[PDB]
Design a protein around this motif. Structure first.
Motif, PDB file in Angstrom:
ATOM      1  N   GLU A 135       0.514  -1.098  -0.205  1.00  0.00           N
ATOM      2  CA  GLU A 135       0.048   0.181  -0.180  1.00  0.00           C
ATOM      3  C   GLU A 135       0.797   1.368   0.153  1.00  0.00           C
ATOM      4  OE1 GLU A 135      -3.079  -0.016   2.754  1.00  0.00           O
ATOM      5  OE2 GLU A 135      -4.057  -1.151   1.654  1.00  0.00           O
ATOM      6  N   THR A 136       0.498   2.409  -0.720  1.00  0.00           N
ATOM      7  CA  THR A 136       1.297   3.324  -0.965  1.00  0.00           C
ATOM      8  C   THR A 136      -0.017   3.960   0.014  1.00  0.00           C
ATOM      9  OG1 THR A 136       2.868   2.701  -2.551  1.00  0.00           O
ATOM     10  CG2 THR A 136       2.266   5.564  -2.268  1.00  0.00           C
ATOM     11  N   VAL A 137       0.360   5.102   0.858  1.00  0.00           N
ATOM     12  CA  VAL A 137      -0.223   6.698   1.756  1.00  0.00           C
ATOM     13  C   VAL A 137      -0.521   7.586   0.933  1.00  0.00           C
ATOM     14  CG1 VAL A 137      -1.162   6.794   4.265  1.00  0.00           C
ATOM     15  CG2 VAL A 137      -0.119   4.317   3.726  1.00  0.00           C
ATOM     16  N   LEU A 138      -1.508   8.426   0.927  1.00  0.00           N
ATOM     17  CA  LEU A 138      -1.337   9.958   1.125  1.00  0.00           C
ATOM     18  C   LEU A 138      -1.574  10.408   2.361  1.00  0.00           C
ATOM     19  CD1 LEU A 138      -1.293  13.091  -0.695  1.00  0.00           C
ATOM     20  CD2 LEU A 138      -3.197  12.151  -1.717  1.00  0.00           C
ATOM     21  N   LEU A 139      -1.615  11.302   2.573  1.00  0.00           N
ATOM     22  CA  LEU A 139      -1.509  12.319   3.545  1.00  0.00           C
ATOM     23  C   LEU A 139      -1.435  13.436   3.465  1.00  0.00           C
ATOM     24  CD1 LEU A 139      -0.068  11.145   7.281  1.00  0.00           C
ATOM     25  CD2 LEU A 139      -2.290  10.259   6.166  1.00  0.00           C
ATOM     26  N   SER A 140      -2.506  14.552   2.861  1.00  0.00           N
ATOM     27  CA  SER A 140      -2.703  15.454   3.167  1.00  0.00           C
ATOM     28  C   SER A 140      -3.180  16.692   4.076  1.00  0.00           C
ATOM     29  CB  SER A 140      -2.754  16.029   1.552  1.00  0.00           C
ATOM     30  OG  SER A 140      -2.959  17.310   1.211  1.00  0.00           O
ATOM     31  N   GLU A 141      -2.363  18.153   4.568  1.00  0.00           N
ATOM     32  CA  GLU A 141      -3.047  18.822   5.573  1.00  0.00           C
ATOM     33  C   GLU A 141      -3.452  19.977   4.846  1.00  0.00           C
ATOM     34  OE1 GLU A 141      -1.499  18.106   8.778  1.00  0.00           O
ATOM     35  OE2 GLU A 141      -1.835  20.568   9.799  1.00  0.00           O
ATOM     36  N   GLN A 142      -4.221  21.139   5.518  1.00  0.00           N
ATOM     37  CA  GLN A 142      -3.849  22.270   5.124  1.00  0.00           C
ATOM     38  C   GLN A 142      -3.158  23.269   6.229  1.00  0.00           C
ATOM     39  OE1 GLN A 142      -4.153  22.929   2.083  1.00  0.00           O
ATOM     40  NE2 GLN A 142      -4.651  25.580   2.095  1.00  0.00           N
ATOM     41  N   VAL A 143      -2.108  23.579   6.023  1.00  0.00           N
ATOM     42  CA  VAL A 143      -1.354  23.565   7.067  1.00  0.00           C
ATOM     43  C   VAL A 143      -0.982  25.379   7.033  1.00  0.00           C
ATOM     44  CG1 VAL A 143       0.362  22.212   7.003  1.00  0.00           C
ATOM     45  CG2 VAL A 143       1.145  24.297   5.725  1.00  0.00           C
ATOM     46  N   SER A 144      -1.810  26.048   5.971  1.00  0.00           N
ATOM     47  CA  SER A 144      -2.036  27.293   6.812  1.00  0.00           C
ATOM     48  C   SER A 144      -3.814  27.813   5.548  1.00  0.00           C
ATOM     49  CB  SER A 144      -0.388  28.586   5.735  1.00  0.00           C
ATOM     50  OG  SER A 144      -1.142  29.699   6.092  1.00  0.00           O
ATOM     51  N   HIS A 145      -3.995  28.725   6.008  1.00  0.00           N
ATOM     52  CA  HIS A 145      -4.911  29.731   4.938  1.00  0.00           C
ATOM     53  C   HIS A 145      -5.338  31.096   4.737  1.00  0.00           C
ATOM     54  CE1 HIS A 145      -9.299  30.411   3.842  1.00  0.00           C
ATOM     55  NE2 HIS A 145      -9.370  31.452   5.109  1.00  0.00           N
ATOM     56  N   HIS A 146      -4.185  31.538   4.820  1.00  0.00           N
ATOM     57  CA  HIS A 146      -3.603  32.675   5.176  1.00  0.00           C
ATOM     58  C   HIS A 146      -2.417  33.584   5.503  1.00  0.00           C
ATOM     59  CE1 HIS A 146      -4.454  37.646   4.832  1.00  0.00           C
ATOM     60  NE2 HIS A 146      -3.549  37.662   5.810  1.00  0.00           N
TER      61      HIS A 146
END
Ligand code: 0T9
Length: 431
Positions: A135-146
């Motif tokens: 399995e290859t895992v993707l994690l994506s996070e929105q670390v900034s908005h401004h």
């Protein structure tokens, strides 16, 4: 309406005039519903690995087989060079995903959802048809908005292939409404103990005036390896009008020194990143043909099973309103999503769950950290590969070299780094 009515519609003309007074914040652009995409920018992280076999191929190349893992040169000189070739083919294979998928699925590039802070997007390619992949895992996070910043990691524990990176932009319009886009950030790829530093290219969005937007790439991307090898990839849009597009030439050098002279290239690759390309060793062979290998999209759990921080679940009502072309309900659902997230963050904090710097941390690389800032360990990969390439370590546009104009601007040096422990100890989110 039919797309052929878009360009002269009242909505379009109104939108074009609003750009004249563009505040520099893209979020603000009051784009009509027909040009809105229902995909958040946190999903764009998936475009790094939509060809699982190409992502993983470098990990299978070793001292004892490398001449058998180098299709365009069975006489390649080293396993290091064979791997540089494979990582280059992988990187080329991402560009079609990254820069063309909205055209094929929505009929043109469209304006993506501006992600909320703390938004998460996770999934996996399970690679069921190939047991040796894992399995290859993707994690994506929105670390900034401004401003908006997306960070991401794609990793394959079975083969010790791991990717981390983050992205952000700055954009402005010209007089003909071309949108010039500079990317910021970088991505690091580790294949067992060998590392590769990748810089994304600048780009421009064409066709806004005609209401049929599309991306074309310009400038350069680099791939600098811990082996010393360097690939310099140059993009161009030559031959528009003749129906050519998405061209590049990539040259691989023994080291960054040789790279200042084109005649020292060990290989030269040229063609179209969204179609085919050939390679010539220091007559020619097919290097990559984007039409022959379809993209494979990661597995994402059903909406009914998603945590409310997860992009698709979180954006669901908004997406449905966009699909329906309803200005009213898009404005309403958006205001609702803001209230949801505000309340959700409150609950997360009440349970003592950190939602802000969930799986990534911001490291300060400037020789003037704030007192207890996070700072890089001594043999940090990024520092050593930036140094081999003479890459600036500041928050300049991706690819800025030391002493370039952009490297001269008291610019910060803050970079996002994945913290695997944080995923292992993750309190809520699963795949
Ligand atoms: C006026 C709005 C126009 C219809 C489109 C303008 C707009 O939506 C911009 C912000 C949007 C695009 O047009 C293309 C998007 C890039 C596509 C691909 C990628 C690669 C990914 O790894 C990182 C995100 C990025 C750079 C997108 C950023 C937002 C853009 C410029």
């Amino acid at each position: 309406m039919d797309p052929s009515q878009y360009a002269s519609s009242s909505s379009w003309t109104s939108f074009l005039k609003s750009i004249a007074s563009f505040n520099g914040d893209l979020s603000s652009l009051s784009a009509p519903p027909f040009i809105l995409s229902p995909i958040s920018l946190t999903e764009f992280s998936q475009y790094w690995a939509e060809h699982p076999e190409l992502f993983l191929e470098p990990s299978f190349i070793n001292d004892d087989n490398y001449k058998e893992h180098c299709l365009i040169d069975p006489e390649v000189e080293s396993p290091e060079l064979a791997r540089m070739l494979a990582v280059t083919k992988w990187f080329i294979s991402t560009l079609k995903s990254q820069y063309c998928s909205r055209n094929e699925s929505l009929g043109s590039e469209k304006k993506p959802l501006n992600p909320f802070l703390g938004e998460l997007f996770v999934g996996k390619w399970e690679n069921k048809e190939h047991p040796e992949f894992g399995e290859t895992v993707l994690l994506s996070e929105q670390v900034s908005h401004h401003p908006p910043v997306t960070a991401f990691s794609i990793f394959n524990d079975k083969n010790k292939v791991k990717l981390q990176g983050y992205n952000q932009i700055k954009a402005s319009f010209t007089k003909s409404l071309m949108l010039t886009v500079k990317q910021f950030g970088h991505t690091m790829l580790d294949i067992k103990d060998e590392s590769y530093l990748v810089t994304p290219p600048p780009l421009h969005i064409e066709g806004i005036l005609v209401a049929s937007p599309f991306v074309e790439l310009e400038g350069k991307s680099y791939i600098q390896s811990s082996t010393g090898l360097l690939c310099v990839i140059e993009f161009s849009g030559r031959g528009y009008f003749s129906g050519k597009k998405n061209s590049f030439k990539a040259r691989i050098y023994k080291d960054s020194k040789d790279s200042k002279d084109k005649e020292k290239a060990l290989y030269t690759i040229s063609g179209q990143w969204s179609g085919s390309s050939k390679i010539i060793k220091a007559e020619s062979r097919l290097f990559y043909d984007a039409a022959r290998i379809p993209a494979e999209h990661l597995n994402v759990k059903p909406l009914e099973e998603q945590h409310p921080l997860e992009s698709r679940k979180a954006w669901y009502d908004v997406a449905g309103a966009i699909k329906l072309g309803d200005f009213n309900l898009i404005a309403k659902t958006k205001t609702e999503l803001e209230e949801t997230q505000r309340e959700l963050r409150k609950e997360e904090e009440a349970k003592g769950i950190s939602w802000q710097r969930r799986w990534f941390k911001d490291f300060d690389y400037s020789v003037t950290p704030e007192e207890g800032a996070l700072v890089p360990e001594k043999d940090d990969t990024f520092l050593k590969l930036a140094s081999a390439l003479n890459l600036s370590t500041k928050n300049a546009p991706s690819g800025t070299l030391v002493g370039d104009k952009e490297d001269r601007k008291d610019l910060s040096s803050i970079h996002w780094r994945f913290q695997r422990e944080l995923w292992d100890e993750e309190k809520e989110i699963v795949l």
